Ligand binder design. Structure first.
Ligand code: HEM
Length: 399
């Protein structure tokens, strides 16, 4: 059994194993870091089944849960938030924060999303690139999702830049373990203080809603509120940064489609849909253990055996998406959903927010900077390490 996670075939490409497995062995066994074996599911239809089957559990203290590293194994010891819950606990806690992320609520946020993107682009213009390329990640891709989610949680404007840097340190590939865990503690300590404050005078933010509607009535206590707030910050931020940067790089690689976006900014939604299918930047989140024996394709998965469902592979499934390895913002979409945000009850709570952010970025960026160019040869883009989710570490641009 091959070791899993697989390595990406190159900087921007999924692992090569997935296409071979989809063709010849779509439910197969892989070997995890600790020697245990898990089942790997690669076809779109089977990923949807794993994501919705009531016979499968996300509870991480069940025998067989497929942790992919040693830190995940010890993270499993902490009190769980709704990301690691089964029904009915899952929606009980998830519904406490879902009102901010509904399509209606995200529509109302759209002026603020646009103002945030406008302000950060205007700052980048004023900085200019007269002394060399600037890093689109540090200058734009990182602060846009960071400022928005921090602001929604309730962080005041003056604290945004420090906390944005600290959260970046958490996931930066060249951080030492001491740097990353110190940045992590910095974030937890700040959120605990913000929770204490909102308990005394609530404002109009997510932490205030939790303190007022759940902590004070006793449905959760203030430490749960910290954990839930922390989850909403760290679950998707690094992914948002990577999606923005991957979108720019992808458009640099497909000049004809960038030309269409420049001439019709209203194509941004379709560009975003294809971006999230093609670059599945969160590919290791759909993991389960079997509560009972369950049949998947031609394989029997026994109780207490772990399953990993690759939405990355599913988003390249030849049986669902015609020419899946071509980036084509003008593709015709089948009835099946792309799985960039997962599927079923656990499907990304922030799907609408994430897409609204991505759509605002790509309908604005080239209107502001019509000559935005990646400043290094495209073959020299600094992608994330091949053993990690696809992403871009830094992206020098001129404009
Ligand atoms: C483009 C950016 C994003 C992508 C591609 C993405 C992708 C995903 C994926 C694949 C999952 C697993 C869903 C499943 O189990 O079926 C997920 C879950 C989640 N995401 Fe996102 N996400 C993004 C942005 C965000 C943001 C901005 C936030 C927070 C504000 C967020 C919070 C979450 C949470 C809390 C979960 C767990 C939901 C649950 O188990 O009920 N994500 N996301």
């Amino acid at each position: 059994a091959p070791s899993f996670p697989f390595s990406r075939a190159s900087g921007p490409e999924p692992p090569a194993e997935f296409a071979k497995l989809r063709a010849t062995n779509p439910v197969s066994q892989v070997k995890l870091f600790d020697g245990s074996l898990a089942w790997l599911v690669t076809k779109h239809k089977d990923v949807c089944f794993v994501a919705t089957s009531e016979k499968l559990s996300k509870v991480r203290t069940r025998q067989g849960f497929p942790e992919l590293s040693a830190s995940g194994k010890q993270a499993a010891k902490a009190k769980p938030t709704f990301v690691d819950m089964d029904p009915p606990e899952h929606m009980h806690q998830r519904s406490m924060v879902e009102p901010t992320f509904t399509p209606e609520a995200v529509k109302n946020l759209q002026p603020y999303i646009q103002r945030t993107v406008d302000d950060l682009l205007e700052q980048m213009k004023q900085k200019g690139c007269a002394n060399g390329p600037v890093d689109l990640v540090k200058e734009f891709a990182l602060p846009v999702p960071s400022y928005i989610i921090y602001t929604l949680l309730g962080v005041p404007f003056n604290d945004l830049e420090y906390l944005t840097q600290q959260n970046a340190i958490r996931t930066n590939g060249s951080s030492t373990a001491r740097e990353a865990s110190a940045a992590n503690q910095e974030l937890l300590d700040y959120l605990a203080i913000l929770v204490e404050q909102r308990l005394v005078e609530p404002k109009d933010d997510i932490i205030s809603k939790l303190c007022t509607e759940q902590v004070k009535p006793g449905n959760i206590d203030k430490s749960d509120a910290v954990q839930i707030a922390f989850l909403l910050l760290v679950a998707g931020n690094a992914t948002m940064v990577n999606m923005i940067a991957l979108g720019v790089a992808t458009l640099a690689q497909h000049p004809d489609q960038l030309a269409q976006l420049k001439a019709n900014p209203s194509l941004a939604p379709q560009f975003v849909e294809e971006l999230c299918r093609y670059h599945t930047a969160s590919a290791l989140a759909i993991k389960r253990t079997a509560k009972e024996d369950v049949m998947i394709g031609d394989k029997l998965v026994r109780a207490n055996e772990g399953i990993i469902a690759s939405n990355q592979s599913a988003n390249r499934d030849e049986e669902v998406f015609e020419n899946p390895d071509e980036f084509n913002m003008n593709r015709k979409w089948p009835p099946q959903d792309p799985l960039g945000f997962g599927f079923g009850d656990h499907r990304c709570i922030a799907e609408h927010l994430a897409k609204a952010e991505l759509t605002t970025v790509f309908s604005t960026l080239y209107q502001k900077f019509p000559d935005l160019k990646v400043a290094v040869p495209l073959g020299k883009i600094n992608y994330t390490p091949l053993n990690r989710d696809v992403g871009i570490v830094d992206l020098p641009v001129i404009f």
